[PDB]
PDB file of C-alpha atoms and ligand atoms in Angstrom:
ATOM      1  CA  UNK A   1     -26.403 -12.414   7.354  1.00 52.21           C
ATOM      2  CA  UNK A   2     -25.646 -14.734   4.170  1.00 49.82           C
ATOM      3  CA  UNK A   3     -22.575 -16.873   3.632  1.00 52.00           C
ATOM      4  CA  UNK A   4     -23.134 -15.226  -0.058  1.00 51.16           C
ATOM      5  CA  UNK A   5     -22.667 -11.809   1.106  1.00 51.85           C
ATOM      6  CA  UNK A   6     -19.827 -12.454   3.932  1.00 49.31           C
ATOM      7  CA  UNK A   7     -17.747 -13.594   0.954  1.00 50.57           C
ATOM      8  CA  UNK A   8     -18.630 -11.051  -0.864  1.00 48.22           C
ATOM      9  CA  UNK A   9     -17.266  -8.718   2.028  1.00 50.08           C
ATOM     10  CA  UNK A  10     -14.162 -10.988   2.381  1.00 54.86           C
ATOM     11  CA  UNK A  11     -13.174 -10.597  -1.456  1.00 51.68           C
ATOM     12  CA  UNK A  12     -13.754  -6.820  -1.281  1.00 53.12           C
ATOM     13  CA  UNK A  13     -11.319  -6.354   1.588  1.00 55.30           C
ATOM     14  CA  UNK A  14      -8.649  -8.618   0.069  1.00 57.37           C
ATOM     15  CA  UNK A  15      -9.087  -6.682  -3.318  1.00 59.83           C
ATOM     16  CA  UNK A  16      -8.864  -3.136  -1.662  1.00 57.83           C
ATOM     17  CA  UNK A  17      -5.539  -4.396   0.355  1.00 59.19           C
ATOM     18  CA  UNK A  18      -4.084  -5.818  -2.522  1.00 60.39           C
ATOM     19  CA  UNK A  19      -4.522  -2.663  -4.491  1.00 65.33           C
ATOM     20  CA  UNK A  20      -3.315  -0.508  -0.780  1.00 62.09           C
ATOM     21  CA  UNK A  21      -0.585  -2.393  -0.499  1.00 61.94           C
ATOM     22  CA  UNK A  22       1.232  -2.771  -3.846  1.00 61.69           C
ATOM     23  CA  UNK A  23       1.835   0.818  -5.640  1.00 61.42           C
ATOM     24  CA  UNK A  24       1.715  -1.113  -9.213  1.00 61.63           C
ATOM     25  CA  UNK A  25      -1.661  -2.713  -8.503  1.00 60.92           C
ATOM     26  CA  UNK A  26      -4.123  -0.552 -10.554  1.00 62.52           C
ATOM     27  CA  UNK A  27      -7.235  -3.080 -10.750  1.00 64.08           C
ATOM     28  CA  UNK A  28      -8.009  -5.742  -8.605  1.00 66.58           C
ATOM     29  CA  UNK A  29     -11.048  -8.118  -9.018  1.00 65.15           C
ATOM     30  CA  UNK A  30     -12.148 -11.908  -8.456  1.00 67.65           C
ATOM     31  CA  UNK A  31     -14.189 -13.321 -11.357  1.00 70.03           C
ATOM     32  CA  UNK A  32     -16.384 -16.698 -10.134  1.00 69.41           C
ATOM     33  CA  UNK A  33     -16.903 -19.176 -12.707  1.00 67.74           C
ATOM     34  CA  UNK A  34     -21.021 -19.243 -12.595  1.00 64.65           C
ATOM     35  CA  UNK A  35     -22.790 -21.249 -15.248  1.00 65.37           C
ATOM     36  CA  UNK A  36     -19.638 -21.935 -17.206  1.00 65.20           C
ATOM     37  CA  UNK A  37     -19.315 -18.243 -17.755  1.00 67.12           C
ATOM     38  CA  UNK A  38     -16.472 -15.707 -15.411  1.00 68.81           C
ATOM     39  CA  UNK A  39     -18.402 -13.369 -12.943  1.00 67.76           C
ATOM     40  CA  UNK A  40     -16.858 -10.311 -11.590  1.00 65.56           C
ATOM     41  CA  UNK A  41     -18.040 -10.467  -7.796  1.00 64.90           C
ATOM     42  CA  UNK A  42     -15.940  -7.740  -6.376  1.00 66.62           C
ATOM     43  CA  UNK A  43     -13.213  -5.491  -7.438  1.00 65.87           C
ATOM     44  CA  UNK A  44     -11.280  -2.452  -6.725  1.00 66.31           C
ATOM     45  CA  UNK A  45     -10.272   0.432  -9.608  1.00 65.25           C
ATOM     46  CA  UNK A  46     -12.159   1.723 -12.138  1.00 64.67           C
ATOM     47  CA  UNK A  47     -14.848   0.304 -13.737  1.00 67.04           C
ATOM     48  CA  UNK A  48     -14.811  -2.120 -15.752  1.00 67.31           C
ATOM     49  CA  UNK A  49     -17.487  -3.032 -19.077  1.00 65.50           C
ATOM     50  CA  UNK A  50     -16.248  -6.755 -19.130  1.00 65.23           C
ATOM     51  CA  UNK A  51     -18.169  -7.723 -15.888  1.00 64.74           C
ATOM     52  CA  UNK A  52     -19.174 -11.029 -17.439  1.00 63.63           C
ATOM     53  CA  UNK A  53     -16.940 -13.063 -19.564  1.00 62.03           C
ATOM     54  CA  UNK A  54     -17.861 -16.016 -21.827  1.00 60.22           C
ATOM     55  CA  UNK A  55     -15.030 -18.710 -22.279  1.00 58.02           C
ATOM     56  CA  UNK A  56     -12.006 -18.325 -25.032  1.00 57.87           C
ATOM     57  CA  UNK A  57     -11.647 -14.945 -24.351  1.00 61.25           C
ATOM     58  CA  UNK A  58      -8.643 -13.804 -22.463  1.00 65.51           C
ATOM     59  CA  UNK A  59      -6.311 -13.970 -20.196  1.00 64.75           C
ATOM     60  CA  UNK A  60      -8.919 -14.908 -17.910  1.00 65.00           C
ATOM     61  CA  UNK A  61     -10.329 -17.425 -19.952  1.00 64.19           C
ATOM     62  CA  UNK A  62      -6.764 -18.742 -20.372  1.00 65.75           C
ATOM     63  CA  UNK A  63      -6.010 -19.030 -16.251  1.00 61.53           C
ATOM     64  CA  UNK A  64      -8.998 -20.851 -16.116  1.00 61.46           C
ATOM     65  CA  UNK A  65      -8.975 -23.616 -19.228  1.00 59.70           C
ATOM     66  CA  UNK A  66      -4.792 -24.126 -18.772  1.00 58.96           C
ATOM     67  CA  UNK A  67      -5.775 -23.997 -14.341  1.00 59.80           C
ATOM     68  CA  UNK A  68      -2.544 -22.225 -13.838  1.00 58.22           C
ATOM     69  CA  UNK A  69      -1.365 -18.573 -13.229  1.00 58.86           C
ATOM     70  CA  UNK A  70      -0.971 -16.242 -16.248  1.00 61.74           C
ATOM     71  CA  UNK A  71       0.891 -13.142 -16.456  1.00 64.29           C
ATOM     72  CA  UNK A  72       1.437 -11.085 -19.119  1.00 61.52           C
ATOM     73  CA  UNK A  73       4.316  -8.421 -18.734  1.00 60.19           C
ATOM     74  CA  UNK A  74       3.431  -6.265 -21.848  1.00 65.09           C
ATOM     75  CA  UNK A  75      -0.024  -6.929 -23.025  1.00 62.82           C
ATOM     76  CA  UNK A  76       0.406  -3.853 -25.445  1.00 61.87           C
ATOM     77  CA  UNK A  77       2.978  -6.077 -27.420  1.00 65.38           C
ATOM     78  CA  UNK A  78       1.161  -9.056 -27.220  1.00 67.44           C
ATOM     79  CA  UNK A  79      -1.329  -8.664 -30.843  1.00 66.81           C
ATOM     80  CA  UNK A  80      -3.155 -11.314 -29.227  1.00 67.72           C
ATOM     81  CA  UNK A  81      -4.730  -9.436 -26.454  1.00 68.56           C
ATOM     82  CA  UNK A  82      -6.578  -6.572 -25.507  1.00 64.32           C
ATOM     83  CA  UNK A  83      -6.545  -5.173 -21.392  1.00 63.18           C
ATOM     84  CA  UNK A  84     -10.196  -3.726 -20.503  1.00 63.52           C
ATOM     85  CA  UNK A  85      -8.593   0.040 -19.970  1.00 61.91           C
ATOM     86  CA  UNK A  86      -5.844   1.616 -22.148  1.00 65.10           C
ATOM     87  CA  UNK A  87      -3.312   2.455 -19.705  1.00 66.46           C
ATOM     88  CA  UNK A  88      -3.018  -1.279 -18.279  1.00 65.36           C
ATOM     89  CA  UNK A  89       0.654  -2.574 -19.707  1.00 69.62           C
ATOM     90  CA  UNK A  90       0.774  -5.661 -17.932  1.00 67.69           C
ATOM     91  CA  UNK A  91      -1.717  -8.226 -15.929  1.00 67.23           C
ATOM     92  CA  UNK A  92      -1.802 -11.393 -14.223  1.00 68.12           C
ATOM     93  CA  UNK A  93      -4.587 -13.877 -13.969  1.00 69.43           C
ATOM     94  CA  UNK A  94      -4.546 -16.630 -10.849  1.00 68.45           C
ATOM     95  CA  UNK A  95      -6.882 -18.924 -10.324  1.00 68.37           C
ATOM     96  CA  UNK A  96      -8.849 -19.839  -7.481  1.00 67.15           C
ATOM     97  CA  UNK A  97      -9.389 -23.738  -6.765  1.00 67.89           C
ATOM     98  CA  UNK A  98     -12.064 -25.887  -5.162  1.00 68.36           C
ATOM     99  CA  UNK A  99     -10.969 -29.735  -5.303  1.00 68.98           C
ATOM    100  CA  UNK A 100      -7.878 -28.935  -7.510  1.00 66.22           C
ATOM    101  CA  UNK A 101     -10.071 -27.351 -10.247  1.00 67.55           C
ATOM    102  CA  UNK A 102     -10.272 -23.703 -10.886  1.00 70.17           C
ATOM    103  CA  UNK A 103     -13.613 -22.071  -9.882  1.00 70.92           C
ATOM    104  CA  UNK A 104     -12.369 -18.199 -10.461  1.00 67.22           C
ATOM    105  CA  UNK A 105      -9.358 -16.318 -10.621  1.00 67.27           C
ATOM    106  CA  UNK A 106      -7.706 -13.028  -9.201  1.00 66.48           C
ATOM    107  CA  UNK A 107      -7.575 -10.456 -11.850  1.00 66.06           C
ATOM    108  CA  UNK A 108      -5.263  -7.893 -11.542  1.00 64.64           C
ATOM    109  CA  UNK A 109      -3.948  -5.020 -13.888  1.00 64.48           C
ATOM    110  CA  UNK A 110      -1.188  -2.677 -13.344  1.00 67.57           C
ATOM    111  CA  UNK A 111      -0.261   0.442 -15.845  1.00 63.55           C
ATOM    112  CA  UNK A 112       3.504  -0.396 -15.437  1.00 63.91           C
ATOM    113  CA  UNK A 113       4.900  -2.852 -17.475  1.00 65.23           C
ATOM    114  CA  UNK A 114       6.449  -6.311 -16.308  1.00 63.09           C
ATOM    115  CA  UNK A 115       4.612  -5.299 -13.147  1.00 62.30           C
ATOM    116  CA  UNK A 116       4.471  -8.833 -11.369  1.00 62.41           C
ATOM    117  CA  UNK A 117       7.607 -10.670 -10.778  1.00 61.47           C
ATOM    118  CA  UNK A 118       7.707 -14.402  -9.462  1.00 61.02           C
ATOM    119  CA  UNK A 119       7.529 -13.025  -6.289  1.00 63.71           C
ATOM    120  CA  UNK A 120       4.406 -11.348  -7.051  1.00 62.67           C
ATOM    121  CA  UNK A 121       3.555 -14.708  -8.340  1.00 60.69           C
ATOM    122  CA  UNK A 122       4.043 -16.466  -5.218  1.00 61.62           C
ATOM    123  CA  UNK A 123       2.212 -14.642  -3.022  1.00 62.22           C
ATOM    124  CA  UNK A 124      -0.863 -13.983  -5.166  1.00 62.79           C
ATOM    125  CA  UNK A 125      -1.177 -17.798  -5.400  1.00 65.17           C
ATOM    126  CA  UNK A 126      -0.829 -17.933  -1.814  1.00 64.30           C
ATOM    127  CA  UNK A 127      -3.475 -15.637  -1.264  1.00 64.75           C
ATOM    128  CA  UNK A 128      -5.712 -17.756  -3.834  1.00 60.82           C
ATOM    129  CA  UNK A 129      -5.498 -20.799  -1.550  1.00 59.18           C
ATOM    130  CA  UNK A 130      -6.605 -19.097   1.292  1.00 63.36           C
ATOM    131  CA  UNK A 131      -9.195 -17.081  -0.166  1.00 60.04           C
ATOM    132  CA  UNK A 132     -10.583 -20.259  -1.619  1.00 59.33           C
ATOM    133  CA  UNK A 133     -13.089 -21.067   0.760  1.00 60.94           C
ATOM    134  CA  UNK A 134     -14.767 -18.033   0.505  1.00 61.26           C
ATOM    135  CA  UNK A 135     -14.960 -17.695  -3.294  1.00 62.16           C
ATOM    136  CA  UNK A 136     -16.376 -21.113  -3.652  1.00 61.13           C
ATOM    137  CA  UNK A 137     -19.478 -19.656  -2.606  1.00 59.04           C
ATOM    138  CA  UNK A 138     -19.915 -17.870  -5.810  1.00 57.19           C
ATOM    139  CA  UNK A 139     -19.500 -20.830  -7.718  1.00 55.51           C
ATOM    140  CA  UNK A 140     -21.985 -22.653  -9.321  1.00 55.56           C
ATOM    141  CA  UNK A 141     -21.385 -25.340 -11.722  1.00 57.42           C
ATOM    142  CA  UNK A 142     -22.450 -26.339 -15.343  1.00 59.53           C
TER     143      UNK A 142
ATOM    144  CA  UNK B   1       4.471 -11.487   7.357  1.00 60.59           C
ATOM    145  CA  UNK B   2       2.982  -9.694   4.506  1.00 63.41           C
ATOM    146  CA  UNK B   3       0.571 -12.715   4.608  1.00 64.99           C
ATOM    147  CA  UNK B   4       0.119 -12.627   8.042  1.00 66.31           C
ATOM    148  CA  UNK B   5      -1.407  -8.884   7.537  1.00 68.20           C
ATOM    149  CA  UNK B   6      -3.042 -10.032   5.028  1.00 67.53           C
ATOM    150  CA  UNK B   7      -4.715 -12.626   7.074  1.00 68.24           C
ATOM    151  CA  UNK B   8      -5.183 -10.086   9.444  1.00 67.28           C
ATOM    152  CA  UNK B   9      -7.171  -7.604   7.695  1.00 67.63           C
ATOM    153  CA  UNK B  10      -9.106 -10.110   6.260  1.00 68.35           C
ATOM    154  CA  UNK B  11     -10.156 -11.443   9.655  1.00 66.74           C
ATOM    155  CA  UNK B  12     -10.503  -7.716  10.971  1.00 66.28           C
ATOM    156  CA  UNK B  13     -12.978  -7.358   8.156  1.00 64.82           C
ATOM    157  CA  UNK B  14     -14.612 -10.665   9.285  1.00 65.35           C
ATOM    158  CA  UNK B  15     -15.200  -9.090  12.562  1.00 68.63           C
ATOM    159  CA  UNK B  16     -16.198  -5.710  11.334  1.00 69.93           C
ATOM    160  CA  UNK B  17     -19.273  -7.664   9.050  1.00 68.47           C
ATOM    161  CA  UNK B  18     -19.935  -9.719  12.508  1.00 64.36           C
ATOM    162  CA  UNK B  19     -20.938  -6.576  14.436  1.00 65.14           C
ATOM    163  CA  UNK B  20     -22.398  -4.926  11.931  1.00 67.27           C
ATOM    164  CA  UNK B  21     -24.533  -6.855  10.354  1.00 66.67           C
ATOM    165  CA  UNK B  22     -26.155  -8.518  13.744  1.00 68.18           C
ATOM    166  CA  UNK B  23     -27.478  -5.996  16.221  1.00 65.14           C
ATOM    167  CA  UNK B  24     -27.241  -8.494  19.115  1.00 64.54           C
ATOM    168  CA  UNK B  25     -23.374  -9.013  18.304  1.00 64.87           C
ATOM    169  CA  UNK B  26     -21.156  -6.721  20.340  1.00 67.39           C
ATOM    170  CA  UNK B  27     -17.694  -7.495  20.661  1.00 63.57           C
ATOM    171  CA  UNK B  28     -16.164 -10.003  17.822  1.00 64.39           C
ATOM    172  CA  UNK B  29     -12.869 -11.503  18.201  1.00 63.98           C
ATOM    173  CA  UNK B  30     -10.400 -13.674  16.787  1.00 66.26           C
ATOM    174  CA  UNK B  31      -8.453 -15.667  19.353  1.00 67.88           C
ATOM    175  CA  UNK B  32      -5.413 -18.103  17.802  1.00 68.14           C
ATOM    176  CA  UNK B  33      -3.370 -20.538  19.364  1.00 67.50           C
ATOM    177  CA  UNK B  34       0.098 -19.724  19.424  1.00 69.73           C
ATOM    178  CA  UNK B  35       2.619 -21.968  21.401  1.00 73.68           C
ATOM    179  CA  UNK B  36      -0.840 -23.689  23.646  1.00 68.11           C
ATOM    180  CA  UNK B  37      -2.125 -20.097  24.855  1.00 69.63           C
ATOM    181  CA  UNK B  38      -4.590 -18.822  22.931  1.00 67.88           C
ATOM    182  CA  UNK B  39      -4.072 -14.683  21.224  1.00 67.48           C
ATOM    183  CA  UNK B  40      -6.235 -12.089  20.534  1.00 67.88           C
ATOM    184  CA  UNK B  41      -5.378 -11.289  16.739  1.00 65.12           C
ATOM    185  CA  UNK B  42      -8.017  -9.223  15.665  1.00 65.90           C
ATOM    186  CA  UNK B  43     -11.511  -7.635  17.000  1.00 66.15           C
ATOM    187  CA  UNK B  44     -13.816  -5.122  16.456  1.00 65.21           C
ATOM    188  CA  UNK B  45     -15.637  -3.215  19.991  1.00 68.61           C
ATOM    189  CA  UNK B  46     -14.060  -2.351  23.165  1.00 66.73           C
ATOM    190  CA  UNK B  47     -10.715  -3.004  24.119  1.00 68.99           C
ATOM    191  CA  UNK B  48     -10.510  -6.295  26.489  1.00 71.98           C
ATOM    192  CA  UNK B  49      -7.944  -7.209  29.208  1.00 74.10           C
ATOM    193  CA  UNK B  50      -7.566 -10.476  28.260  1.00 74.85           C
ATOM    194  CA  UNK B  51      -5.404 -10.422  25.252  1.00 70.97           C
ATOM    195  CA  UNK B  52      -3.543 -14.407  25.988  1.00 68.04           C
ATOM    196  CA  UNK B  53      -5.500 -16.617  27.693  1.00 69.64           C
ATOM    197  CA  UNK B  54      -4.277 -19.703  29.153  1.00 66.52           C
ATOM    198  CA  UNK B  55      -6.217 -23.249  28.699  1.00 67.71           C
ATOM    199  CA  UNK B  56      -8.140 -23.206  31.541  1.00 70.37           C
ATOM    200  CA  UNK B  57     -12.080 -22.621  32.761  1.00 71.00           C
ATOM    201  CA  UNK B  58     -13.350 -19.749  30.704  1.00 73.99           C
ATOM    202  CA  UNK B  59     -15.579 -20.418  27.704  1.00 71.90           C
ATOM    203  CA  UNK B  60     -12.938 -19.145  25.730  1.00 72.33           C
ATOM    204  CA  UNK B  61     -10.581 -22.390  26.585  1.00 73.26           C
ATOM    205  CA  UNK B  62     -13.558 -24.523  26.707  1.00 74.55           C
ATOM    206  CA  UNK B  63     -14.284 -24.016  23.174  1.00 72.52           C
ATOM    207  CA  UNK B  64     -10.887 -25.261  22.043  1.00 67.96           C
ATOM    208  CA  UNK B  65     -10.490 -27.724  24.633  1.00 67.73           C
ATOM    209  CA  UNK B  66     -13.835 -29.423  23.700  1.00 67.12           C
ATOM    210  CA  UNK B  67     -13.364 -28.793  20.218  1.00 70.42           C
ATOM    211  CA  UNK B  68     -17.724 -27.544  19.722  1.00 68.86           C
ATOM    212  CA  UNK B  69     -19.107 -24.401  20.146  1.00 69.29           C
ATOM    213  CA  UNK B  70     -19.711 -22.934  23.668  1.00 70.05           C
ATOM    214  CA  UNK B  71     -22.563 -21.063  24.175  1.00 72.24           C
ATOM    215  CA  UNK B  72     -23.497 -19.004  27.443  1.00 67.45           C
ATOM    216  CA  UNK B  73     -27.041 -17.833  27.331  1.00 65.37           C
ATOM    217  CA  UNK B  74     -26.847 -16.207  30.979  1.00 64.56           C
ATOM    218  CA  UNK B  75     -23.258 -15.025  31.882  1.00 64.28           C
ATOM    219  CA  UNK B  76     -23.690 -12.817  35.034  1.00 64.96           C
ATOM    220  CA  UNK B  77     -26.096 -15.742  35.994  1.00 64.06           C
ATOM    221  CA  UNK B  78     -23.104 -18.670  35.869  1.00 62.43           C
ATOM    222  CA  UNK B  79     -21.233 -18.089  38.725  1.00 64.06           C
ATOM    223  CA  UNK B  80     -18.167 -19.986  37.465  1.00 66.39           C
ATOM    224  CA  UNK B  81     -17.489 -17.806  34.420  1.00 68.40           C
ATOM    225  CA  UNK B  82     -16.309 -13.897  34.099  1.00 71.25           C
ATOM    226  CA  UNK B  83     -17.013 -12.081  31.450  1.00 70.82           C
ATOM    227  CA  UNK B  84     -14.263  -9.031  30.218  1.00 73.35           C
ATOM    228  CA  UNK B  85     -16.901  -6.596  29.603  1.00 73.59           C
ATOM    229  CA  UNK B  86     -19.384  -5.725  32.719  1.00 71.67           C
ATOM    230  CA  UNK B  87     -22.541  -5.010  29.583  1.00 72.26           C
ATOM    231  CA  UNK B  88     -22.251  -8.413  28.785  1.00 72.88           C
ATOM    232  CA  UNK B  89     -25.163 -10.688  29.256  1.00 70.65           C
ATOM    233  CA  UNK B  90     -24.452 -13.889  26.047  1.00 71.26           C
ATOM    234  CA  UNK B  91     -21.360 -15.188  24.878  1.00 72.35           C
ATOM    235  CA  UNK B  92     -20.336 -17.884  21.884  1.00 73.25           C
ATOM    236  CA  UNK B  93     -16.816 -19.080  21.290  1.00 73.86           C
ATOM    237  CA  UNK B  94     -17.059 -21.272  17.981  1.00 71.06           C
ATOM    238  CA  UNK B  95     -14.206 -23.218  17.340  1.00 69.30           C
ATOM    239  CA  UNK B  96     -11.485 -22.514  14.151  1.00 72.00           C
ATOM    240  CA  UNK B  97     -10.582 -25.934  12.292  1.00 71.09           C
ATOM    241  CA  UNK B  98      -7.631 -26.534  10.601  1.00 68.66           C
ATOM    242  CA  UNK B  99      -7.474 -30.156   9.480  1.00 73.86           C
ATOM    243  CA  UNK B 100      -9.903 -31.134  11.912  1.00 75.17           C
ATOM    244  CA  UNK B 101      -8.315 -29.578  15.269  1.00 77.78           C
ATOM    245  CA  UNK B 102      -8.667 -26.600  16.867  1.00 81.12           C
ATOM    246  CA  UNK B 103      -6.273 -23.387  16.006  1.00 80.23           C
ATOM    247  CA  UNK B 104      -8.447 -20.416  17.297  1.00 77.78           C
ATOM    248  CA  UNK B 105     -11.590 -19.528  17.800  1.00 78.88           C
ATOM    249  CA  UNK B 106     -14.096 -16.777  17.075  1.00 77.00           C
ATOM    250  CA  UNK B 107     -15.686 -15.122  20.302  1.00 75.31           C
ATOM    251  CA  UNK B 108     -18.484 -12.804  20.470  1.00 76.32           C
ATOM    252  CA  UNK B 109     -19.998 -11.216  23.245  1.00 75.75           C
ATOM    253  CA  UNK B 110     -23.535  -9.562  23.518  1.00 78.94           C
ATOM    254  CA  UNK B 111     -25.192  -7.473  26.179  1.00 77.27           C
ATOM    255  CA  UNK B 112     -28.694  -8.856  25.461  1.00 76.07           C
ATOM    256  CA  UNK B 113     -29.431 -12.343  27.151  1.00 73.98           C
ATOM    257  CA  UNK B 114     -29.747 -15.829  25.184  1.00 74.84           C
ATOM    258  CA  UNK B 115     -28.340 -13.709  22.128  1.00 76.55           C
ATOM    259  CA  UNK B 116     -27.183 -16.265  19.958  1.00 74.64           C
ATOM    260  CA  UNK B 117     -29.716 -19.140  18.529  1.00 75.15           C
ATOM    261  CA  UNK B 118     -28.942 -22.067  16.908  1.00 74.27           C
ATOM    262  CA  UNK B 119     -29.117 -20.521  13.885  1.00 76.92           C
ATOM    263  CA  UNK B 120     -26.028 -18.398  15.126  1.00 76.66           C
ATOM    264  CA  UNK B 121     -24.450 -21.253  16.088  1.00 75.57           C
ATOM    265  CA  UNK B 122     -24.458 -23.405  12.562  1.00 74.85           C
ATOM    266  CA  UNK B 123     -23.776 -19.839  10.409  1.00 74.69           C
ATOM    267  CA  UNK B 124     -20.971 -18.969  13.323  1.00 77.80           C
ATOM    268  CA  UNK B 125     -19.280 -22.699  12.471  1.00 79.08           C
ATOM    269  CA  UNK B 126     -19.868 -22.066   8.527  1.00 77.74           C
ATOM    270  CA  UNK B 127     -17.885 -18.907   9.117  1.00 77.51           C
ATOM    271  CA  UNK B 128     -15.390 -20.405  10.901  1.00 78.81           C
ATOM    272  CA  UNK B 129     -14.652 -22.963   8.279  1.00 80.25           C
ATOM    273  CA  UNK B 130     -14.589 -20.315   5.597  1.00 83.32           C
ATOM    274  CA  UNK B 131     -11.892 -18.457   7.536  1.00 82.84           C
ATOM    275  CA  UNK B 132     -10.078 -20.979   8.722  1.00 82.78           C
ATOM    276  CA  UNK B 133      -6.885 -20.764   6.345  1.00 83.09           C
ATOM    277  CA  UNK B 134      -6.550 -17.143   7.058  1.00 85.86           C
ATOM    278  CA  UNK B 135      -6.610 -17.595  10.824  1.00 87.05           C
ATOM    279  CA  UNK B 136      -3.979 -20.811  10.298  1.00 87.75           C
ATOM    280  CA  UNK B 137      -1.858 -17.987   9.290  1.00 85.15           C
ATOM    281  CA  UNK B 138      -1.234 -17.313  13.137  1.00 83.85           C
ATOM    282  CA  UNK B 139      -1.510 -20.479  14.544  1.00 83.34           C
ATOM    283  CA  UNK B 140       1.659 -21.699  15.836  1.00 87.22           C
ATOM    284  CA  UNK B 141       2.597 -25.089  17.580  1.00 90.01           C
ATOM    285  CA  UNK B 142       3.584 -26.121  20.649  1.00 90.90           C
ATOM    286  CA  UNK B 143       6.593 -26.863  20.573  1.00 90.83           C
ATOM    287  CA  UNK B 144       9.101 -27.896  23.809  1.00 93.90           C
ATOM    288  CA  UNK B 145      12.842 -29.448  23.414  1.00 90.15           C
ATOM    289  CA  UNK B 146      11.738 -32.772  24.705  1.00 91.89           C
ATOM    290  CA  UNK B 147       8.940 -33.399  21.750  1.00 94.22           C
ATOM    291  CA  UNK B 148      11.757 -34.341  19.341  1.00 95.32           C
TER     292      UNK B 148
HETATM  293  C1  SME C 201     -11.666  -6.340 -16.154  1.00 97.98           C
HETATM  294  S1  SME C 201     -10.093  -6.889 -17.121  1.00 97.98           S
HETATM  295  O1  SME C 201      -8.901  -7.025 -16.092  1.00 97.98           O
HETATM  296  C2  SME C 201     -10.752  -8.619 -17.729  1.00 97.98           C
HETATM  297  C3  SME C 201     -10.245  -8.972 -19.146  1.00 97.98           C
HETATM  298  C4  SME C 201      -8.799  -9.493 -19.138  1.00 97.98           C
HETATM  299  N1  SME C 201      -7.901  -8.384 -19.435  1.00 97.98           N
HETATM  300  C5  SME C 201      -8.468 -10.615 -20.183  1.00 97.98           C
HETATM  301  O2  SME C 201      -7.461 -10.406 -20.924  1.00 97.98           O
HETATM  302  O3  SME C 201      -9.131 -11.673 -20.190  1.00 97.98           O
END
C-alpha cells in the first residue's frame, strides 16, 4: 500500500458520504494545490472538464488566495462567475490547511440555490480539519 | 453526531483499504478509548466478542498502555495472550495519537505467522497519524466526580 493512495481512498469515501448524506449536494470533490496549480484528486458527480485549475480563476482560486470558506448562493446571478455544469445554482469552496495555510479545498456544487447555510458552513470546515492530514499528502509545494 | 458518522465511515473505509489491499491482513479494527475502556468503533472481518476491553494484559491494552506498537509474531505460541479469532496466528495493535497520547488504537489480526514486518509497523503508525482526528471523534475522557 501507499500513503498516496490510502488518502486517495479516504477523500473518495468522505466525498461519496457527503454527497449520500446531504440531498442538495450534487458534486463533491477535493482539489490539492500541486505545483502552485488546484488538482482534482477525487470527487463524486459527474464529470467534470476543469480537473486542473491555474490560479485567479474561481471560486476555487478565491478559497485558496483569501484562505477562507467561499460560498456562493446564486452563482447564475453572480456575472462574475461561471459553475463547471449548467444546472449548479449555488457552490461553496473550503479550504483544507496544513500549518494554517491552505493546501486544497472541498469543492462542492448543488443545483438548488442558497444551498449551504452557516450550518452547512460549519460542518464542512469541520470536516476540512480532520480530513487535513490526509490531503496533505497530495500537496506539493512551489 | 453527524460527525461522529462521519468519522465513522471514514475509519470503516480505513479498515476496508487495510484488508484489502494486504493479503496477510485479516481482521482490521478500530478500538477508541471512551471513559478508560477501550471500544470497538469500526472493523472490517468477522465479528469479535470483545467489543470493550478493559486496560489490562492483552496486546490490545498493552498498546495503549505502553503508548508503541505491539507486535505478536506467534500468538497461539505465547501462552499469556488469547486471541478472539481461533485462525489467528500474528497480531499488531498500533497506537492512535492525539496530541501525543493515546486515544485508540488500530488492531489487525492475521492467520499467517510473523505477518506484519517492520515495514507494517512504520506504514501502520503513518496511518495512524493520518487518522487520528477522525478517531478523536470518539475518544472520550475519563472523567470521575473527584477529578474536579
Ligand atoms: C469542478 S467545479 O466545481 C470547479 C470550478 C469552480 N466552480 C470555480 O468557480 O472555481
Amino acid at each position: 500500500m501507499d500513503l498516496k493512495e490510502f488518502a486517495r481512498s479516504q477523500m473518495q469515501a468522505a466525498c461519496q458520504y457527503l454527497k449520500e448524506k446531504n440531498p442538495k449536494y450534487d458534486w463533491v470533490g477535493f482539489y490539492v494545490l500541486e505545483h502552485g496549480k488546484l488538482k482534482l484528486e477525487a470527487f463524486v458527480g459527474e464529470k467534470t472538464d476543469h480537473v486542473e485549475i491555474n490560479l485567479g480563476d474561481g471560486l476555487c482560486s478565491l478559497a485558496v488566495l483569501k484562505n477562507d470558506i467561499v460560498n456562493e448562493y446564486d452563482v447564475k446571478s453572480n456575472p462574475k462567475y461561471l459553475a463547471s455544469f449548467p444546472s449548479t445554482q449555488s457552490e461553496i469552496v473550503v479550504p483544507v490547511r496544513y500549518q494554517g495555510e491552505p493546501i486544497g479545498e472541498i469543492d462542492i456544487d448543488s443545483d438548488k440555490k442558497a444551498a449551504f447555510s452557516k450550518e452547512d458552513e460549519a460542518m464542512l470546515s469541520s470536516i476540512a480539519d480532520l480530513m487535513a492530514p490526509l490531503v496533505h499528502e497530495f500537496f506539493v509545494k512551489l
